[PDB]
Every structure is written in structure tokens, then in C-alpha cells.
Design a protein around this ligand. Sequence first.
Ligand SMILES: NCCC(=O)NCCc1cnc[nH]1
Length: 213
Amino acid sequence: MLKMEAVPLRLEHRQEVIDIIVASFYNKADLEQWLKPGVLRTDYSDILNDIWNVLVERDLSFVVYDTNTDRIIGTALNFDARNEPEVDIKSKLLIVFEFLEFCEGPIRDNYLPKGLNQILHSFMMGTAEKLNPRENIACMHFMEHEVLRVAREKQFAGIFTTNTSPLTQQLADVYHYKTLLNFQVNEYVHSDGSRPFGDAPDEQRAIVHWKEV
Ligand SMILES: NCCC(=O)NCCc1cnc[nH]1
């Protein structure tokens, strides 16, 4: 059985976390696949490197170790939704985060509690490529169990996230997240009038989830 341990994010974890996040969102990503081409492996390392110190300082993120190998197999990058770093993303990933803000912004700032230390934004969650289905399913449950524990320990009012893959969306629903938006990603219009995910099927959703803790 997979034996896992959730360790808070340390500064030395940068390259291990970047590898996992690139693996989970490069050509495997449900939104990034439609921005092909022009999205390189380094675009997510660039974002993570720009926010790495603040991400570790906020002490809201953790990595998941396989205690049998003492290697990181998963990570949950979290921020206070009302206290996130300012990112000038100079890649095509700007459309992704502008789309996520398009999904989150209106709901966050109008229907979610006001003030800091209220909204725990589970904005990124990744697992290692080597994980087989069982290891991945088990690691996803472990990270969900831990973001709740971190949310309660850090005294947040609830967990807030936009789930962009069918697996994370289903996990959120069986974990009793409330659905606050079920948006069809091929209907989102970029600033230039185009639909960056217009080639995605109608069935691909960006679901904004929220569970009070
Ligand atoms: N509870 C899961 C949160 C998560 O990992 N969401 C990823 C959304 C995303 C896609 N591309 C950039 N961000």
C-alpha cells in the first residue's frame, strides 16, 4: 500500500515541485492542450520560480512524500485567495489564469467571505508521472484530506478551487464541494475576441468548487 506523508513546503523543494507541476500541466493539462503551440515546459517553471519564495513563506502549501522511497510524489500549492502574489505572466499561460480568474473573480469577491485568512485557494495540485492509477488515486485522496486539515488548522472558512480535469472535478463532488460555477471552457472569449479553448468539446468544464470547513 502507498504510505504517504504531508510535509509543509520548504525552499529546497523548488525543483521537485516544478517537475511535478510541469508534468501535471504540460500537454497533460485540459486547458493547456488547446493553447498548442506556444506553451513550453518552462512557462510553468517561470511562474513557480517567480512565486516560489512567497509560496513557501505563506506556509499554506505542502508536498507529499512516499515514505517508502522518501521521494515527493505530489504537491498542493495553496494561497489565501485574497492574498495571492501578483504575477505578470508573459506566456500563453496568461490566458489560462485570466480564464480561471474569469471563473473565480466574480464568485470570490461577491459571494465568498470577506477578509484575509477566509478563503483557502487550492489553486494548484499535482502528482508525479510515475504514479500508477492506484498510487495517483490514493495520493489525490491524501492531498484532499490534507488541504482540509491545513484549512482547519490555519483557521480558514473554506477551501476554494477551480477544477479543470474530469478526475479532480469528480473528486471534489464526492468530497462534497459545492459547485459555484460550471462553465463550458469552449465558450470563454479572450480579450481579442477569440475562443482559446474553442476547439475543446462541450463536455469539458471548468468547475469552480467551494467547501466550508
Ligand atoms: N483542486 C485542484 C486545483 C487545481 O490543481 N487546479 C488546476 C487549474 C489550472 C490549470 N492550469 C492552471 N491552473
